Amino acid sequence: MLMPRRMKYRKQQRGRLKGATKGGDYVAFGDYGLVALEPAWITAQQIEAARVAMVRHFRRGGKIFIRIFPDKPYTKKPLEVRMGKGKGNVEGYVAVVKPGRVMFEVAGVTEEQAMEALRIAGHKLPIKTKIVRRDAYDEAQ
Amino acid sequence: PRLKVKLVKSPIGYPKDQKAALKALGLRRLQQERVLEDTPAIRGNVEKVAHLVRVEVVE
Amino acid sequence: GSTRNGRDSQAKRLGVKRYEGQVVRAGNILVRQRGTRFKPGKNVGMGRDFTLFALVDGVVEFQDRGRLGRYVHVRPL
Amino acid sequence: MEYRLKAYYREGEKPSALRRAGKLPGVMYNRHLNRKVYVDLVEFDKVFRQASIHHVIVLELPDGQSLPTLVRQVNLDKRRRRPEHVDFFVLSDEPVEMYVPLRFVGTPAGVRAGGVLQEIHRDILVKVSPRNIPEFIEVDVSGLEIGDSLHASDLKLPPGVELAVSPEETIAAVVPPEDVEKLAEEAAAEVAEPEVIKKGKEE
Amino acid sequence: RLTAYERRKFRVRNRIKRTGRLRLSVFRSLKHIYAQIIDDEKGVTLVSASSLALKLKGNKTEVARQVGRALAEKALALGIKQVAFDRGPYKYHGRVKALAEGAREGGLEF
RNA sequence: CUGACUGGGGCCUGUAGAGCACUGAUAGGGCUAGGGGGCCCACCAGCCUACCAAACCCUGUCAAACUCCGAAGGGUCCCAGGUGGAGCCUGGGAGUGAGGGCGCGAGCGAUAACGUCCGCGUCCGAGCGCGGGAACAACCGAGACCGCCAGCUAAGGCCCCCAAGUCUGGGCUAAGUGGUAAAGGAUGUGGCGCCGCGAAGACAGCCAGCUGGUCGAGUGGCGCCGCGCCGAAAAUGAUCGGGGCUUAAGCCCAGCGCCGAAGCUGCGGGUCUGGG
RNA sequence: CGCCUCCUAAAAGGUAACGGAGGCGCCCAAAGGUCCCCUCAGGCGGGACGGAAAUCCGCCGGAGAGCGCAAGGGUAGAAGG
RNA sequence: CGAUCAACGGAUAAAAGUUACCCCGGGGAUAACAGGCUGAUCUCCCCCGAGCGUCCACAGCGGCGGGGAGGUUUGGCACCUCGAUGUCGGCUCGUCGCAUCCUGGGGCUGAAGAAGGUCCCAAGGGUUGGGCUGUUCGCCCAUUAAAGCGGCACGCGAGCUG
RNA sequence: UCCCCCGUGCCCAUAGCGGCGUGGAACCACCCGUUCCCAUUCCGAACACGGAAGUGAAACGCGCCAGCGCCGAUGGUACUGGGCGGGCGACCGCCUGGGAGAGUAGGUCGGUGCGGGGGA
Numbered sequence A: 001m002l003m004p005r006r007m008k009y010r011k012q013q014r015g016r017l018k019g020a021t022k023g024g025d026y027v028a029f030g031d032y033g034l035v036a037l038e039p040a041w042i043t044a045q046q047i048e049a050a051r052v053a054m055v056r057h058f059r060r061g062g063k064i065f066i067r068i069f070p071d072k073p074y075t076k077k078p079l080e081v082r083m084g085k086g087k088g089n090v091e092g093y094v095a096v097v098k099p100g101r102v103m104f105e106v107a108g109v110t111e112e113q114a115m116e117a118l119r120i121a122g123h124k125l126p127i128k129t130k131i132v133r134r135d136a137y138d139e140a141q
Numbered sequence B: 001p002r003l004k005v006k007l008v009k010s011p012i013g014y015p016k017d018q019k020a021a022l023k024a025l026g027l028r029r030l031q032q033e034r035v036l037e038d039t040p041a042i043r044g045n046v047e048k049v050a051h052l053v054r055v056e057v058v059e
Numbered sequence C: 001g002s003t004r005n006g007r008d009s010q011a012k013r014l015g016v017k018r019y020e021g022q023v024v025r026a027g028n029i030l031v032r033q034r035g036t037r038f039k040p041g042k043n044v045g046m047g048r049d050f051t052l053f054a055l056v057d058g059v060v061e062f063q064d065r066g067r068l069g070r071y072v073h074v075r076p077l
Numbered sequence D: 001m002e003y004r005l006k007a008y009y010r011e012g013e014k015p016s017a018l019r020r021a022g023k024l025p026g027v028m029y030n031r032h033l034n035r036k037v038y039v040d041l042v043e044f045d046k047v048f049r050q051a052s053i054h055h056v057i058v059l060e061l062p063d064g065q066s067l068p069t070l071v072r073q074v075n076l077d078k079r080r081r082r083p084e085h086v087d088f089f090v091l092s093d094e095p096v097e098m099y100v101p102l103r104f105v106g107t108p109a110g111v112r113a114g115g116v117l118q119e120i121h122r123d124i125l126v127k128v129s130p131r132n133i134p135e136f137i138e139v140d141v142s143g144l145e146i147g148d149s150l151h152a153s154d155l156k157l158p159p160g161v162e163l164a165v166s167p168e169e170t171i172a173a174v175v176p177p178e179d180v181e182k183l184a185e186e187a188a189a190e191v192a193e194p195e196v197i198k199k200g201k202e203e
Numbered sequence E: 001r002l003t004a005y006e007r008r009k010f011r012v013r014n015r016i017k018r019t020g021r022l023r024l025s026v027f028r029s030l031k032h033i034y035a036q037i038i039d040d041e042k043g044v045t046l047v048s049a050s051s052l053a054l055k056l057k058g059n060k061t062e063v064a065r066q067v068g069r070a071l072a073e074k075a076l077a078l079g080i081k082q083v084a085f086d087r088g089p090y091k092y093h094g095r096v097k098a099l100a101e102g103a104r105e106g107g108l109e110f
Numbered sequence F: 001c002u003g004a005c006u007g008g009g010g011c012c013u014g015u016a017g018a019g020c021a022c023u024g025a026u027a028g029g030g031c032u033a034g035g036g037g038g039c040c041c042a043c044c045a046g047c048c049u050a051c052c053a054a055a056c057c058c059u060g061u062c063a064a065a066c067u068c069c070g071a072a073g074g075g076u077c078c079c080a081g082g083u084g085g086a087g088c089c090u091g092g093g094a095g096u097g098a099g100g101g102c103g104c105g106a107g108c109g110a111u112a113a114c115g116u117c118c119g120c121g122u123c124c125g126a127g128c129g130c131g132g133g134a135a136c137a138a139c140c141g142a143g144a145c146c147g148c149c150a151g152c153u154a155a156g157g158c159c160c161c162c163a164a165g166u167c168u169g170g171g172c173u174a175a176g177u178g179g180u181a182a183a184g185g186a187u188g189u190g191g192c193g194c195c196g197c198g199a200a201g202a203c204a205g206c207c208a209g210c211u212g213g214u215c216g217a218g219u220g221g222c223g224c225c226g227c228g229c230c231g232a233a234a235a236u237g238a239u240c241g242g243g244g245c246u247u248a249a250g251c252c253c254a255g256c257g258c259c260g261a262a263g264c265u266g267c268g269g270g271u272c273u274g275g276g
Numbered sequence G: 001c002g003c004c005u006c007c008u009a010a011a012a013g014g015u016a017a018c019g020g021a022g023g024c025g026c027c028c029a030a031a032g033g034u035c036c037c038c039u040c041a042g043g044c045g046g047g048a049c050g051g052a053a054a055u056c057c058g059c060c061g062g063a064g065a066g067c068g069c070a071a072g073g074g075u076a077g078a079a080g081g
Numbered sequence H: 001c002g003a004u005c006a007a008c009g010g011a012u013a014a015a016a017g018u019u020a021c022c023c024c025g026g027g028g029a030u031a032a033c034a035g036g037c038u039g040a041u042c043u044c045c046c047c048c049g050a051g052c053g054u055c056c057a058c059a060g061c062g063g064c065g066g067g068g069a070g071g072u073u074u075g076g077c078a079c080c081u082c083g084a085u086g087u088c089g090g091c092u093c094g095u096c097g098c099a100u101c102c103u104g105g106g107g108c109u110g111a112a113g114a115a116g117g118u119c120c121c122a123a124g125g126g127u128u129g130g131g132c133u134g135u136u137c138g139c140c141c142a143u144u145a146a147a148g149c150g151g152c153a154c155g156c157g158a159g160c161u162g
Numbered sequence I: 001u002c003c004c005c006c007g008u009g010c011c012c013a014u015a016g017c018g019g020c021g022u023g024g025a026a027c028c029a030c031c032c033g034u035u036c037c038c039a040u041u042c043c044g045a046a047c048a049c050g051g052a053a054g055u056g057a058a059a060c061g062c063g064c065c066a067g068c069g070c071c072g073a074u075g076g077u078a079c080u081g082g083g084c085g086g087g088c089g090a091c092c093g094c095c096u097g098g099g100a101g102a103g104u105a106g107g108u109c110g111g112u113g114c115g116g117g118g119g120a
């Protein structure tokens, strides 16, 4: 599932999740979108699980755009060790997601078909979501 | 014109540079009123500690 | 559990030592640097480690000459 | 068609205060003028949702004027997803670059095979006279297979409109659909660990 | 995208301005040969001399020597004595060398 | 008179933010060397690809060790205000070299710890002196020389315990919510919108066989905002500090008044410093 | 466990953790001084043996090359040849 | 000029181990027991509804993922106690929690009946005797309405055992 | 002082790439030779010398075109010194002073100082 093919550096400092999204805040590919309402590190396991939910809903048809990618390595020290002895090991990758970003877009599917698929996928995510459709506001960006 | 500055909130717990400002203004006790010549240098301090003080324009 | 890291080097305390408008004497060090971030200008020599030092008594001046880089000058008094 | 919108001049009032009053701040400008203006949010929304950056908007100013403008840029609140600023471009007799809607007339053969039409450009940038603004531009996608595509080159243009994008620019394509049959083989794809771009005597 | 000519010209001139003297720069064309002494501190030419302005004769080498003396005579009259020889892109040789040796003969200091 | 701090002025900087021009990452599409695959060939090539995909281009993005950009600030010199238990110089005497909470910026940890390691600030340390927070070193208020059965205020408060309003005006809440919790769920309640469908007779139904008919006024969804409901299981006896409170003694908006400290004032006194 | 480079380091300097990553314990008699010349990587096209790349020719190419070795700063108006 | 004085401000020109036979001075500045804080781990309850259940997403189940509660496990931290907080298991004596093993009361059932399944309410009482092993735990015998799980310094050594 | 050219600086892409056009009287250039000074890891290509038949073809100078490159507001916003509120938090707001980046409108096929040679 979703992870970088290679990187310059193996481990990354945790950083912070302050503010509204940097960009990617408007619909840009499909007809309908799923937008994050609160900040989080969204894991590769979640993204894929959120995707599979949608394709499973469509059965055949539709197109799924995944507009977030987990390039941030998640670190964790082995079980029951003490503090110190360096930094932990990489156990997965997450995508940093701040409020306002369109995470998923669907296209080529009926409205009620998009509403449900994005809702279902919405349940696989660790945050509050909002479903949105393409506007002229999006077109003007 | 002159400035009538009055210390009305304690400097305790505020940065040492704000405490220094009061010293430049010459304000040492609460509720103390001092009258100062409205120059830019005097005004800067009076504005640095504007959350501790009450200013009224006189003369 | 161990690490192969843990090393680092003594800080070299580089940078401009006298800014524009500051009076210097002959020999005063003006810029400490790696390579030529600043270049020797009027009345200013350069040492073997790119060290900029005042050649005369006077006042420092900086001038940014675009693609020519930045220059440090000492104006005689 | 062509829509109308009341606009008012604004001075030193705070953009924050205006937006709280229900009024959406903006600016009016061209090569000749530049005026601080504000519209009503709810009214402007009604217009813009259809007008967009595609149709002319006449701005009924309180001084008595009525300038015919295009919206050139809209600023969104990235958190709340709402407009926060409007750029009204005061149009004049000279030609002007702008975005013109596309209608993809026809049902592609790829679509009959289960495929999906991805409308890459839902409009196209065009240099044209203000008097010469088309309501849309038709495009035949009926001959599109999985996976074929059209470009701005294949766009047959109305009189007086000139392409402002590369003719190489892809505009629409028909792509294969999601399939559950793909899930099994997509899940069976085992992934090797991310190699490291190295530093030093390795890099 | 510079040329060997431009770089050669630049490289030797930067070296001259560094010493901060007045510079005796010399242009040397196919027919003629000009020379000016410049204050790069002020961006000002102080004394001029050329074959074209002296209406001089035949052999370009022998001509140069004459414009050299010409420059020096006009020079000392202005209080200028010491100066630095900007050989430009030209190798110190022949025509240019002769111009210099003439300036020296005329009492110019370099 | 040079000090902290402050006003103006120059110079240094690469963070916040943002960006993709470099180093890398990256989704999709386009174009297109390379393979893979199929019709096709050994005679050397073709051709089609709903295959994996280089470089390039487009749309959209990610980065402490990326930066085409780049603040607020910060450092320093100059002139000026600043006479302060300020500053500078020589010397005598130390103590300290286990810090801690809190706020903000990071790393480490698990976007754990009354966690740990730095940074800027603060307080406790040494203010376990005083008012508030039920109680409580470090949260709010405030720096306690002594005296007074005088006055004004700070935080916090004004139904009774308990000093001062059962104070005034507008609104919400019916859950004792207030008086500890999440995804998610819901004809709770009030309030703003937005679509439909309706006296070209809607909706509910009451009928004859989805039509009508029958009545005669609305009806059916979306979404947003305020306040509430569920989700809500733990070990000695219960409780918001208690009693008790429901057009509040709860919550939101706007006011006037009071109460309240060792802060401020009045009066008296001490000591030191400065000036007569 | 000393030394060098980058990050952490919060745009002066400095700043810790058994924090993230790499290097040094040499070398060069020219790889040094000076004077005088010269300008790269890479891309497309052309050329016997000659190939992705040997040497040659042309056009484009601000520096992405090179600078003994890590990294950063610097640098062709040379510190590179 | 002779330094891997590299523990790199370099004790001597010259140096390894062991102590359950041990001792003194100190520390809760620092480990082991318990508590505390935390809740990764653990136990439990939910959200979503792919899919199973002849038929039928929800009788019974619940892919991939999501949110919590508890404070019984193993841990992390090192905050009171190192001028002493005695540490497993058993015996004895209990008392509480309820996420209820039984008995009482319910809804749904893929509930004919009888008997089960699953969830809801309910802490009043009850919850056996044995063999193995120090064991807690667990396996096994024979029964039973049932042979519940946890807290109380893993309750209880100025109460016993050892 | 105005016009053109040759020098030499400054500003440091609004000055650049590409396209087109124009200039040889003068200046510059290419050009004609390689005797002589001097030169080629081979080559008079370059450097250099002696010249003046030719040509402005290459170069260079001067103009014009906004396809690319470069400059780029106003407005809004992010962020923030300082002062305050909110949440159990991740985090979220208010006041005051400062205020980006992207993008939009638009700008640009240079400006200028000194000295010479020529012209009015």
Ligand SMILES: NC(=[NH2+])NCCC[C@H](N)C(=O)O
Pocket: I080, I081
């Ligand atoms: N004017 C300022 N400096 N504002 C500070 C901005 C950050 C502040 N904590 C906020 O939430 O708003």
Ligand SMILES: [Mg+2]
Pocket: A041
């Ligand atoms: Mg995580």
Ligand SMILES: [Mg+2]
Pocket: A014, A074, A075, A076, F110
């Ligand atoms: Mg982590």
Ligand SMILES: [Mg+2]
Pocket: A080, A081, A082
């Ligand atoms: Mg352990």
Ligand SMILES: [Mg+2]
Pocket: A082, A083, A084, A085, A086, A087, F108, F109
């Ligand atoms: Mg660690």
Ligand SMILES: [Mg+2]
Pocket: A075, A076, A077, A087, A088, A089
């Ligand atoms: Mg770790």
Ligand SMILES: [Mg+2]
Pocket: A043, A074, A091, A092, A093
């Ligand atoms: Mg993971």
Ligand SMILES: [Mg+2]
Pocket: A021, A022, A096, A097, A098, A099, A101
């Ligand atoms: Mg995001």
Ligand SMILES: [Mg+2]
Pocket: A122, A123, A124, A125, A126, A127, A128, A129
């Ligand atoms: Mg969710």
Ligand SMILES: [Mg+2]
Pocket: A141
């Ligand atoms: Mg954009």
Ligand SMILES: [Mg+2]
Pocket: B009, B010, B011, B012, B013
């Ligand atoms: Mg205070």
Ligand SMILES: [Mg+2]
Pocket: B010, B011, B012, B028, B029, B030, F143
């Ligand atoms: Mg005080």
Ligand SMILES: [Mg+2]
Pocket: B012, B013
């Ligand atoms: Mg305080």
Ligand SMILES: [Mg+2]
Pocket: B015, B017, B018
């Ligand atoms: Mg301050």
Ligand SMILES: [Mg+2]
Pocket: B017
């Ligand atoms: Mg300060």
Ligand SMILES: [Mg+2]
Pocket: B028, B029, B030, F263
């Ligand atoms: Mg006082």
